[PDB]
Each structure stands twice: as C-alpha cells, then as structure tokens.
Design a protein around this ligand. Structure first.
Ligand SMILES: *[C@@H]1O[C@H](CO)[C@@H](O[C@@H]2O[C@H](CO)[C@@H](O[C@@H]3O[C@H](CO)[C@@H](O)[C@H](O[C@H]4O[C@H](CO)[C@@H](O)[C@H](O)[C@@H]4O)[C@@H]3O)[C@H](O)[C@H]2NC(C)=O)[C@H](O)[C@H]1NC(C)=O
Ligand SMILES: *[C@@H]1O[C@H](CO)[C@@H](O[C@@H]2O[C@H](CO)[C@@H](O[C@@H]3O[C@H](CO)[C@@H](O)[C@H](O)[C@@H]3O)[C@H](O)[C@H]2NC(C)=O)[C@H](O)[C@H]1NC(C)=O
Ligand SMILES: *[C@@H]1O[C@H](CO)[C@@H](O)[C@H](O)[C@H]1NC(C)=O
Ligand SMILES: *[C@@H]1O[C@H](CO)[C@@H](O)[C@H](O)[C@H]1NC(C)=O
Ligand SMILES: *[C@@H]1O[C@H](CO)[C@@H](O)[C@H](O)[C@H]1NC(C)=O
Ligand SMILES: *[C@@H]1O[C@H](CO)[C@@H](O)[C@H](O)[C@H]1NC(C)=O
Ligand SMILES: OC[C@H]1NC[C@H](O)[C@@H](O)[C@H]1O
Ligand SMILES: OC[C@H]1NC[C@H](O)[C@@H](O)[C@H]1O
Lengths: 391, 390
C-alpha cells in the first residue's frame, strides 16, 4: 500500500492471543478488555523499554465495541469497560509517544459478534480518523460472498485514504479468501500495509510449526511480493506467555525476523520474565526484522529434520537461521559450506559471522571455501549474521 | 512383584531420551553412550543433591553392548565405549552410594539391533547378578509372537529371582501386547516391579498430553492394580531439556506424582537450569510421589478444557492436581466444591490446603461447605495438598 507507512514491518502490542474476548470485568478484572488494561499496558511500554526497542503501536483487537451503534449509526466503545471512549484513550496513548490501533470487520458482524462494518465503510473510516486512531486491523468473519470480501477490503482501503489521516491498514483478506480461491497478492499489496495469510496463532509449538510449514510451502507465492509498505503477516509473537519453551521462543523470534514479519507482541507486560523481555528487545535481531532493504527471507534447505532459512539484508549482509526439528535427544550438529549461503555472495571472498541467537557470539572470519559448523538444540534455532568483507 | 523392592516408585536417571543411541565417540566424546558419561552422571548425582532427593538408580538403556556375545555366550559391554566392563562400573556406582540399572530385550535383538536375550534368559540374569546390577529394563522388540513375549517376561522374572540378588525388574510387557490383546495386569504385577504401558516419550508437550490422555482413558483397568512392588510406568521425566515450557514441566512433575509413576530423569545433569533442578528436587512433590500408601491417583473430572486429578495419601491426606488444557489466552479461573474432592472425606469437616505447584503457598482452612478457587496457566497444573483437620 503506497501510503508512506510500514516502510519497515510494523512493531507493537496486540491484545488478542493473551486476553482474547474476556468481558468479565467483575470476576476477571485484570484480564478483561478495558480502557484500564490498555492504559496500564501503554505505561509499561514506555517505562520498561518497549518503545525504545521499536514497539510503537498499542493495538486493540476484537471485543471493544458496544453491542449497538449509536443514534447516528457510528460505532461506539462499550460504556461499561471503556467509559472515557476511544478519542480520550487515543490522547493518552499519544501523550506517551505511542500510536493506537483499533479493530473492525468487513462483514455484518465482528468474529466475536459485535457490529460489523459492511455498509458503513466510509462512516467507520471517518470515525476512526476523528478518534485519532493510527492503525486498523480489519477481519473477515461473517462475509459469505467472495465479491463482498474483495469489495469491502478495497472500499475500506480507499475510505481510510480519503480521511487524510495516516492509518496503517492491516488486512485479513488473503486468509478469508483461501476458502474461495487463491489470493492475488499484487492486488492485496495495492490496498494493504500487511496481510494475514494463515490461521490464528496460539500459545503452542504446534502452532509455530504450522505457520512456518505453511509459509515455506507457499513461499514462491508470497515471498517476492513482500517489501516496504506491504508485508506478509504470520500473526502475533507469543513469546512471554506459557506454551513455548525457551528454544521455541528463540525459534519464533529468529524466524519472524527472517520472514520480515510485523512484530505484534501478544502477552502481559506486567508479568513477563527477564529472559523473554531480553529476547523480545534484542537490538540485533530487531535490526534484522527492521532491515531497510525489506526483502523477505525464505527456506533454503530442508532435510534430516533440519531447516536452513536465510534473508538478504542491506549492504551485502545476510541473516541465516538453522532450525532443529527433531524433538528427541540433544543438541545436533549441522554443517554447511558458506558458499551455499547468501546465493554464493555473502562470503565471497569472505564474511564475518556473528551468532545472534540463542546467545550472542562473534564466530570469526570465514573464507569462501570454508565450512560453518553449528550445534542446534531440539526445537531451537541458531541465528547468524553474515557480513561480507575483504579481511 | 513380591521381591521386597520398589515399595515406593523407583527413582533415578536413565539415558535414553536425552542421549539415545549415540555411538559416535570420535566426534562427540562427551555425549556418546560410554563408561565416561555414566561416571559423570554418577558424580553429579552425588555432588548436586540428586541422591539426597531420592534419585538412587543410575540406569543404562539400549546401546551398551558389543555386537557379539563372547565365546561362552555371555553378553559383553562394548570394548571401546565401556573398556572396564559393567561390573567395574557397578563397583564405582556403589562406592558413591548409588545403584546400577542395565538394559536387555526379551526378543532376538534389542530395539537398537544388539544381542537379544531370547534363549539366554538364565545366562543373562546370572551375568547381570555377577556384575552387581541392581535394576533391569527389559524391552520387547523383535518378538514375533504373544506367547513367546509372555513366556520370556515370565522366564526372566524367575531367572532374576533365582540368582539370589535383589534386582528391580522393569517390564515393557503390556506395551508390546496392547495392539493385539488386552493385558492381564494381575499377571504382569505378579512378575514385574513396574511396566511401561504406552509409547516412548519425547521432548514435547504433545507427548505429555498423549500419555496423560491414554492414562485417563484407560484408568478403569490400570489404576487399581498399582501399589507397593508394582507400578504403572508412563515413561521418563524430560524436565531439564528443551521442548517443554516451564508450565509444561510443572505439569509433568505434578502428574507423575499423582500417577505414582517411577521417576526416571532423562536429561543432562551437567547442563541443567536452576529452575528445573529445584522442580525435580522439590521435597514436597517427591513426598507425594513416594507416599507409602502407594495408591495411584486418577482423573476425577474433565471438561471445559480443564482436568482435575486426585490421589489419596496416607493419614487421610489427598493430592489434587488441576490442569488447564487450553493452549491459548491467559490464566483461567477454575472452581470446585471441596466436598467433591477426596471422595467427600478430604475436607470433612474441614481440611487445610497447601498449594505446592507452580509455587508453594498455604491457602488456609476450608470448610466442608467451601469452594476451591484457582487460576491455572495454559498447559500448566496447580498441585495442592489437602490435610484433613479431624
Ligand atoms: C492516499 O493514496 C495516495 C495514492 O496512493 C497516497 O499518495 C502517495 O503517497 C506516497 C508517500 O506519501 C508518495 O510517494 C512519495 O513521493 C515523493 C515524491 O516523489 C517522495 O519524496 C516520497 O519520499 C520517498 O523518499 C524519501 C527519501 O528521503 C523517503 O524518506 C520516503 O520514505 C519515500 O521513500 C515518496 O516516495 C506518492 O507519490 C503518492 N502517490 C500519489 C499518486 O500521489 C496518499 O499518501 C494516500 N494516503 C493518504 C492518507 O492520503
Ligand atoms: C524371589 O521370590 C520369593 C517369593 O515371592 C521372594 O520372597 C518374598 O520376599 C518378600 C520380601 O523379602 C517377603 O515379604 C516380607 O515378609 C516378611 C514376613 O512375612 C515381612 O516382615 C515383610 O514386611 C515382607 O512382607 C515375602 O513374604 C516373600 N514371599 C515368600 C512367599 O517367601 C523373594 O524375595 C525373591 N527373591 C529375590 C532375590 O528376588
Ligand atoms: C448482511 O445482512 C444483510 C441482510 O440479510 C444482507 O443483505 C447482506 O448481504 C449481509 N452482508 C454480507 C457481507 O453478506
Ligand atoms: C492481479 O491483479 C492485478 C491488479 O488488479 C491485475 O493487473 C493482474 O492481472 C492480476 N493477476 C492475475 C494473475 O490474475
Ligand atoms: C527368534 O528367531 C528364531 C529363528 O529365526 C525363531 O525361531 C524364533 O521364533 C524367534 N524368537 C522370537 C522371540 O522372536
Ligand atoms: C488374570 O490372571 C490371574 C493370575 O494369573 C488369574 O487368577 C485371573 O483369573 C486372570 N483373569 C482373567 C480375566 O483372565
Ligand atoms: O475475534 C477476533 C479474531 N478474529 C480473527 C482474527 O484472525 C484474530 O486474530 C482475531 O482478531
Ligand atoms: O532402543 C531403546 C528403546 N527401546 C524401546 C523402549 O520402549 C525405549 O524406552 C528405549 O529403551
């Protein structure tokens, strides 16, 4: 989408995976979807280093709306859980230097059952602009027609543009098109800043595997269309929660960087381990994800329960990620000729290789003819950066 | 098995899940199956608190043998990887106050392809006794009929007995007859100290779920046969490795206690996090697993992606474990009338409830009318001990 936004993958926090559609502010006050939750999460984004690391957008997912529209047909925030409304929450977020994301649906209803935007696209776009929203996640539930789906996504895109307000437009168009026909990605990119391709993530290693496997399987369709202003979205980062081991968390961070994915944390910043914080705030790995060249990475190799992925970066650098998919035993040895990496360019005549994950270590100079030997933990990933040099 | 052993579930360390059948001592000398590896684990079992916690048996799994038997038909350990021989390794292990487990197969080969014990049962038993072995894991690969499977497991049982040495006998009998015929657990118990029921574990949450699910599904026929001298074996603890989250590790520890399972760690004691060490050495949770009554726990409830399991303990005490099987979102609230716990006698007229996992906390006195409210992390378990006030 040619709107001057998302020139690098958008970074921020989105409530869905960790907080879902909890409406019980009586029995579950700390996890219910409320202005207080977003206020507190905003504060922590500032005070705990997230904004400095790059996490800029504080985004509300589904279940923020009142059951009805108002007397003017405009969307409202629920009056019990968001008494001060979206406009004032938007002021609170901007005063902290952050930006605000909100959520809406192409259909008659949102996935959770609240008012959809079908037939109100221009009204909703303007309300979002008037409120000072900075990002829109636009879902695809309760749309049974292919024509409607495409029409709605296109219409809303233009409707946002017409408000004159800079709003990152996050689409679920391709995901909700899979049931009808293969998506046209040139068209989707024309209208969207990023796009969900695959099923909702959850707090499990199974879910990570499935996203990587789908992405690698479909990579000839989706990799080359990614670039500044239009990214593939493999869904939220779930590092910091309950279901991934340390190594699985490392795999997610590594591969989301390799994949030029948007980085939307879905976790609780009030209760997050120092280990997870440091991984999520890892300057070098974020720098890979945010590389200005903006070329999405891909799977180079697959075999013997190993995968090798790589991503080209600016200034002749490459990130290389090696996964061990064997879920039994101990650290497994993997070796590759550095001339097979980075299309034969990375280490010609030589490169300097720095290991970034699971720990940071300078590995040294590698000649074009030489071999990189690495040990990889089960369900873990080793992430390296290759700097082309003459020394 | 009426041999005076495994009066509580056997506790120790077994190499398989973490080290498998690595024969490459040339390229990976510190992780290949060798005399050195078990020496290191033995030392660490003493110096790092494992023995004191209860982990007593240092057990060798498959891939310790030489390819051939010797010219007398006795099994041998691999000459390069185990240069001093098993007996010498047993001497070492005993000098540290520990006990030694070895591995063998009822069929024509071990699962990894080394000499099986079929037709050598009495010879092998005696060799193991002469070596000073203290435990035998006896697998079921390369056995072509149910009759010879049963015959072999029975024969070896008696053969071990007749050596006059005390040897914990770990069977895989039920696992290998399950696909063809329902097992008679009364018979298995008669011959075995514990028995593997289900597929090999690995370093994943998927594998943990599968074991729990199979165990709960089959509980009507395996729970009541367990007791001092005969335990159900849901396989090794994999806490300390790579594939389980903290909460999934907690779930394994909690449920293995509830299940009166043998506690065989399979990990690397040279590289293990303080978090995992403390969970594996948790005095209160081990005390549940080791409860002298020896009555296996069971699933009480299942619904709304929650499970409740419970185990009766000595002196009118109970353990209760609550699992959250929903793998999305955050800590979920679960509530239950304490009168539904412990068959209605745990908290009559009252009980004192101490949460043990994921952290230890006194919860206080609960009346027979009361309700236990708890929040449980996704893929996590909360473990409580109920003390009847009387
Ligand atoms: C509504 O839709 C229209 C049409 O798509 C859209 O207008 C487009 O906006 C982009 C970016 O704002 C314009 O592209 C710019 O062109 C100018 C002049 O050539 C460049 O200077 C811009 O900067 C580039 O280079 C800079 C170097 O320092 C970089 O910092 C910067 O990131 C850019 O790479 C940029 O290329 C584009 O020209 C228009 N298109 C048209 C047809 O006018 C509009 O913004 C949409 N949204 C809204 C809210 O109106
Ligand atoms: C080989 O098999 C025989 C027969 O099963 C075993 O004998 C049994 O050994 C146990 C444990 O020592 C005896 O139990 C004990 O009995 C005494 C007194 O009755 C009691 O004080 C203890 O608390 C315990 O119950 C058991 O009675 C005995 N059974 C018989 C029938 O003799 C023997 O242990 C086995 N030998 C080896 C080397 O495995
Ligand atoms: C919403 O419902 C109306 C009334 O039945 C219908 O006309 C319209 O097609 C529905 N919207 C979508 C996206 O199908
Ligand atoms: C995809 O859409 C674009 C823009 O609408 C169009 O020009 C192009 O031909 C389409 N591609 C295919 C393969 O249909
Ligand atoms: C072992 O092999 C022999 C010879 O092939 C065969 O007769 C016997 O049935 C086998 N025994 C078992 C237990 O599989
Ligand atoms: C199981 O085996 C025991 C002991 O061998 C025997 O007494 C019992 O009757 C058997 N039960 C069945 C159902 O075959
Ligand atoms: O119900 C909300 C839900 N809708 C569908 C999306 O794919 C999810 O990420 C989430 O936004
Ligand atoms: O080959 C060894 C392997 N055999 C099968 C057993 O069930 C496993 O636990 C392990 O001991």
């Amino acid at each position: 989408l040619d709107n001057g936004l998302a020139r690098t993958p958008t970074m921020g926090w989105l409530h869905w995976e960790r907080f879902m559609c909890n409406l019980d502010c009586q029995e579950e006050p700390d996890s219910c979807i409320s202005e207080k939750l977003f206020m507190e999460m905003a504060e922590l984004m500032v005070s705990e280093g997230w904004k400095d690391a790059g996490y800029e957008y504080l985004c509300i997912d589904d279940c923020w709306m009142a059951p009805q529209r108002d007397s003017e047909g405009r969307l409202q925030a629920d009056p019990q859980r968001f008494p001060h409304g979206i406009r004032q929450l938007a002021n609170y977020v901007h005063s902290k230097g952050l930006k605000l994301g909100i959520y809406a649906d192409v259909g008659n209803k949102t996935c959770a059952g609240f008012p959809g935007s079908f037939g109100y696209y221009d009204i909703d776009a303007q309300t979002f602009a008037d409120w000072g929203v900075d990002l829109l996640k636009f879902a695809g539930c309760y749309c049974d027609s292919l024509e409607n789906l495409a029409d709605g996504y296109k219409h809303m895109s233009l409707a946002l543009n017409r408000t004159g307000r800079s709003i990152v437009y996050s689409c679920e168009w391709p995901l909700y098109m899979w049931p009808f026909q293969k998506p046209n990605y040139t068209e989707i990119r024309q209208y969207c800043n990023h796009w969900r391709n695959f099923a909702d993530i959850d707090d499990s290693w199974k879910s990570i595997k499935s996203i990587l496997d789908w992405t690698s399987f479909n990579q000839e369709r989706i990799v080359d269309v990614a670039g500044p202003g239009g990214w593939n979205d493999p869904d939220m980062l779930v590092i910091g929660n309950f279901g991934l081991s340390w190594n699985q968390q490392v795999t997610q961070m590594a591969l989301w960087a390799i994949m030029a994915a948007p980085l939307f944390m879905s976790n609780d910043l009030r209760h997050i381990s120092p280990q997870a914080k440091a991984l999520l705030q890892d300057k070098d790995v974020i720098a890979i994800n945010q590389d200005p060249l903006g070329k999405q990475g891909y799977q180079l190799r697959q075999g013997d329960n190993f995968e090798v992925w790589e991503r080209p970066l600016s200034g002749l650098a490459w990130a290389v990620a090696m996964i061990n998919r064997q879920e039994i035993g101990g650290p497994r040895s993997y070796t590759i000729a550095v001339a097979s990496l980075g299309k034969g360019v990375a280490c010609n005549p030589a490169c300097f290789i720095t290991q970034l994950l699971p720990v940071k270590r300078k590995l040294g100079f590698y000649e074009w003819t030489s071999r990189l030997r690495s040990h990889i933990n089960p369900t873990g990933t080793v992430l390296l950066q290759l700097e082309n040099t003459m020394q």
